[PDB]
């Protein structure tokens, strides 16, 4: 069945790096686009990044360009996110989710599935 278990998070220092991994199982992975969506304690969630099926069309938020790099590996059906130059405001709980459609821009960023975990710095 469809489940998304993420890991790789932890404590870091400001201006460092982190490599978040997301393992998905239960569905056809190569068909659907993926999204990272974070939520800070107190504020409603905000989408972090949206990545395509081919891994060629990628989109980030207006405040994280140049600092982040989203990617995916279709062999192990897994999702990678490289966060560099961690600002203090990126301190939130990160979420890995599987888009409704196989697209990125068709429709506003909203998801219809479960979640794993996310660390804070």
């Amino acid at each position: 069945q469809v489940q998304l278990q993420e890991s790789g998070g932890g404590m870091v220092q400001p201006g460092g790096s982190l490599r978040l991994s997301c393992l998905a199982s239960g569905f056809t992975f190569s068909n659907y686009a993926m999204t990272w969506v974070r939520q800070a304690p107190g504020k409603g969630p905000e989408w972090v990044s949206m990545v395509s099926n081919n891994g060629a069309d990628t989109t980030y938020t207006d405040s994280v360009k140049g600092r982040f790099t989203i990617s995916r590996d279709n062999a192990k059906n897994t999702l990678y996110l490289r966060m560099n130059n961690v600002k203090p405001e990126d301190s939130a709980v990160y979420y890995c989710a599987k888009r409704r459609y196989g697209g990125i821009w068709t429709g506003q960023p909203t998801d219809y599935d479960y979640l794993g975990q996310g660390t804070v710095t």
Partner: protein, 51 residues
Amino acid sequence: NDTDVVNFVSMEFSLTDPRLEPHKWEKYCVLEIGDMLLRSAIGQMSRPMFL
């Protein structure tokens, strides 16, 4: 002479609006230059920008 005045014009950007304290400046000449999209802990502020 060193004592002499030199005059000029000065442009320094500003977020906070006037008309909250119009007494503070009887001298400024405030323009509007649109929005700057500040990021707070929740949402986005999108306050205007004056000069």
